[PDB]
């Protein structure tokens, strides 16, 4: 019980800060390509200059693909490692693409193409990234039941 | 001791993605400043266009405040606060220095100065960066034991 | 999995700086944070915290150790720093980095395998 | 500025018997003890944490109370393998820690 809780417990957080790493990718994505700062509105267009935006996403890629090398389950094993494969795709789909991602002035629909999951063609990482995605929810909906199996130990057995 | 597990963890994994998302700035301040996608390094260098990336960083600045703002909790209420008014200062330093910050040709410099809050001169927002992961540590901290008092119920 | 390992120079002369750095395995600073802190024993005495770091980078010092050290954390997360200047002797100890966290306990958890450093001229 | 105190530095058990330890607290650190075991040649194991749970992986031979000043660790039929110094340690502060000066437990003959 009291094993059980404190194991489970740390996979919950440990998966859910991976999902909340994949946010920091989708906000800037949906919110920040082709912007800029803006003293009123906060932001403001610049089209066609989201290279360094890239870079920043592709930092954060890389920091979820070492949290996913931290998460060790032996339940969570299939799912972790289908985990792992999906991030490491979508990792190595921005450096194939870097002809068009490795400038300065990355224009907006190639930079939608590779990280706005929600764009209309998604063949510069963001299908990756969409599988990523589902890879990552399909391990939290595993690892919330095995929270809550934990705790279902307090009434019944 | 059935509600209470429950409740806290939810604090806690509220609290521990804002530190998630304060996680994603300094990593991009880290390692993408200045830098460029490269197919075989995965970075490489690139000077003094750093907009895009920045306006990123704001981006996900204003998320956290979002995040910060669902938090509610009576205890915490005043320490809330503080991570929330901490955060507004941040977001409102960035868009004051929206002369130097807001373009395309933010040079690497003013970047650091920015976002990078171990940066060695502070004066475009990092200091209040620096300000705001204190602040929501503290309500990290705070959130660690209330969760953990909870489960050593059991004995 | 949870594994700390240690760090560099054994022997420095005294009034200089030694610095030391303990690298994760098996892990990272996640969820958000854990692996922080830094503790030394020195001959013929017990044990005594130096300070502590978090996964932002914010430091605690001891005091009596007060502008001396400086604990850091590299980016790209696998290993953290410790600074500890100026070193006269009675800085000579073995040294201990160890995760300080973790949900449940607020201490004091996973160690290392404990360093030696000499300060002599 | 805050002060643990074990109250026999050195302590002599004939083996298989009780060990009892004390620390002392020079003001209140609440339930926030930690009990570390240090063999010669190794690094410290943590043995009580909150000062009453004991770290997994450690046998159920040692236990804890707490709540306040008193603080005890009591080794119930120590065996060979549990001679060694045994420190306490406030962590009411939560980076911030003090260990006690130590207390060897040694072979009774």
């Known amino acids: 019980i009291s094993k059980k809780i404190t194991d489970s417990n740390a996979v919950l957080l440990a998966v859910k800060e991976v999902e909340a790493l994949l946010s920091s990718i989708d906000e800037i994505a949906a919110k920040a390509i082709g912007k800029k700062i803006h003293q009123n509105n906060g932001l403001d267009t610049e089209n066609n200059h989201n290279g360094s935006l890239l870079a920043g996403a592709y930092a954060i890629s890389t920091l979820i693909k070492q949290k996913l090398d931290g998460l060790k389950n032996e339940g969570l094993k299939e799912k972790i490692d289908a985990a792992k494969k999906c991030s490491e795709t979508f990792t190595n789909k921005l450096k194939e693409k870097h002809t068009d991602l490795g400038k300065e002035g990355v224009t907006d629909a190639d930079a939608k193409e590779a990280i706005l999951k929600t764009n209309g063609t998604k063949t510069k990482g963001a299908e990756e990234l969409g599988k990523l995605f589902e890879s990552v929810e399909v391990l939290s909906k595993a690892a919330k039941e095995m929270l809550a199996n934990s705790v279902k130990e307090l009434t019944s057995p | 001791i059935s509600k209470k597990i429950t409740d806290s963890n939810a604090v806690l994994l509220a609290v521990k993605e804002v530190e998630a998302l304060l996680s994603s700035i300094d990593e991009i301040a880290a390692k993408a400043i200045g830098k460029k996608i490269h197919q075989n390094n995965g970075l490489d260098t690139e000077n003094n266009h750093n907009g895009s990336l920045l306006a990123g960083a704001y981006a996900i600045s204003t998320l956290i405040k979002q995040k910060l703002d669902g938090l509610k909790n009576e205890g915490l209420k005043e320490k809330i606060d503080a991570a929330k008014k901490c955060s507004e200062t941040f977001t409102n330093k960035l868009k004051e220095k929206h002369t130097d910050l807001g373009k395309e040709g933010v040079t690497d410099a003013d970047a650091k100065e920015a976002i990078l809050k171990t940066n060695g001169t502070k004066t475009k927002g990092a200091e209040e960066l620096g300000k705001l992961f204190e602040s929501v540590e503290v309500l990290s901290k705070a959130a660690k034991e209330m969760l953990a008092n909870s489960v050593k119920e059991l004995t | 999995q949870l594994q700390l390992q240690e760090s560099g120079p054994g022997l420095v002369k005294p009034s200089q700086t030694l610095s030391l750095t303990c690298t994760l395995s098996?892990?990272?600073?996640?969820?958000?944070?854990?692996?922080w802190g830094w503790i030394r024993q020195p001959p013929g005495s017990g044990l005594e915290w130096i300070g502590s770091?978090?996964?932002?980078?914010?430091?605690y010092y001891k005091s009596s150790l007060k502008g001396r050290v400086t604990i850091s954390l590299d980016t790209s997360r696998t290993q953290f720093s410790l600074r500890l200047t100026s070193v006269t002797a009675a800085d000579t100890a073995v040294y201990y980095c160890?995760?300080?966290?973790?949900?449940?306990?607020?201490?004091?958890?996973?160690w290392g395998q404990g360093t030696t450093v000499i300060v002599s001229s | 500025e805050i002060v643990m105190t074990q109250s026999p530095v050195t302590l002599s058990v004939s083996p298989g018997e009780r060990a009892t330890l004390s620390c002392r607290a020079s003001?209140?650190?609440?339930?926030?003890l930690a009990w570390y075991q240090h063999k010669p040649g190794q690094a410290p194991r943590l043995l009580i944490y909150?000062?009453?749970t004991r770290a997994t992986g450690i046998p159920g031979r040692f236990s804890g109370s707490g709540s306040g000043t008193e603080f005890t660790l009591t080794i119930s039929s120590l065996q060979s393998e549990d001679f060694a110094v045994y420190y306490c340690?406030?962590?009411?502060?939560?980076?911030?820690?003090?260990f006690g000066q130590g207390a060897k437990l040694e072979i009774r003959r």
């Open positions: 003001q209140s650190v609440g339930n926030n």
């Open positions: 098996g892990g990272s600073i996640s969820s958000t944070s854990y692996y």
């Open positions: 340690q406030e962590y009411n502060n939560w980076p911030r820690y003090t």
């Open positions: 160890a995760r300080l966290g973790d949900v449940f306990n607020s201490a004091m958890d996973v």
């Open positions: 909150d000062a009453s």
């Open positions: 770091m978090y996964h932002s980078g914010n430091t």
